[PDB]
Amino acid sequence: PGSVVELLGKSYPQDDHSNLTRKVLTRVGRNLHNQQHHALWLIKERVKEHFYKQYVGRFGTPLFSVYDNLSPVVTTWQNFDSLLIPADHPSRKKGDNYYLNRTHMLRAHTSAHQWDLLHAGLDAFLVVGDVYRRDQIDSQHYPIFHQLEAVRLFSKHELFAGIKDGESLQLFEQSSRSAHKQETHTMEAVKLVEFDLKQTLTRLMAHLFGDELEIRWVDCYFPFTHPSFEMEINFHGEWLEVLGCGVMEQQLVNSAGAQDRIGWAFGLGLERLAMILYDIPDIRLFWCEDERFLKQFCVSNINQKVKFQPLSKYPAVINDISFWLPSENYAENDFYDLVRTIGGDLVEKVDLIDKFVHPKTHKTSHCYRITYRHMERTLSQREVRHIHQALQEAAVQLLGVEGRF
Ligand SMILES: N[C@@H](Cc1ccccc1)C(=O)O
């Protein structure tokens, strides 16, 4: 019926957590980040060259070994617990992740590999991979996107190698956790690690854009780094975040067996960066086959500056859909998964526009506005109407909604 999922050779029995769609599974193994002459592959290769050629360390440049072919199938221990993410944390919700079952999932971030690669004794590495998230539908969100993770560890004498009294300064102490440092980190060590992290990323961004770009650092929170930041780029008059980063939580680094090391880590969104770097308006464009988009990244070398040229934009068709919710058996993201399945890359966005409760029946009603717009052509009213009608019938069959229309 709907038991057992088979993926990349292996078999995953379904259960109460399982919520993959066939549609999302058809994207696993595509590995756009590894597809020669794809925009995302291009960014990856330029980041690789920056760390192989331009990073500089007081000892030597750390060798950043590159892992761009790790399977996206991970345990919840890799994806969450290894990163100190609490058991009650909202990032674990079934509404937000693609679970194969209670124990295996599609990784929601490339940070799901930090512990394993630290555990193998690496001091510096890059991880590049497709990641998976259940979320809303708009031009900035897609069920699969791509991240590049970097981790860089320091020994005590390496970090203090430029100073005249180095072997009396230390990495570790026992004090209190502040806005600026972890409880077991010295302020001396954190200031140097933070400086190296931000200098590295600032130079990487100048390597990718130019020297005129406006960036800012925004303090934020992650369970697996502290202090932590998001880097934001000002683009089309708006500050857009492109990465998260910070000083790695020492419990994580210690638990992987690197107890004599302090580190930084960052994770950048390749689509978010690519959309700024090349002015790409819609994330669906990374997945189309229109040569008008694809050929622009086929360049002679990975440093030939591609000057992406805008595509024509086609008119939209807007249709509403209203139904009564099942009696306490419904998630917004379930409907978005269904729209992706039926509507696919015809759908530009979905907004929940209205909700209310009916007193006589106690039923909740949702109304969603669906914006149909194709990236490659004009849609006819007719094909959209039939697709929209098919969506309504699938919604009744599969989600147990009650058509209100
Ligand atoms: N994993 C974070 C990014 C990040 C990576 C490494 C350190 C800190 C933050 C995300 O997906 O948003």
Residue numbers in the entry: 11 to 415
Could you give the paper's own sentences about this structure?
Mutations in the mitochondrial aminoacyl‐tRNA synthetases (mtaaRSs) can cause profound clinical presentations, and have manifested as diseases with very selective tissue specificity. Patient symptoms range from spastic paraplegia to fatal infantile Alpers encephalopathy. How clinical manifestations of these mutations relate to the changes in three‐dimensional structures and kinetic characteristics remains unclear, although impaired aminoacylation has been proposed as possible etiology of diseases.
Using steady‐state kinetic measurements of phenylalanine activation and tRNAPhe aminoacylation, we gained insight into the structural and kinetic effects of mitochondrial disease‐related mutations in FARS2 gene.
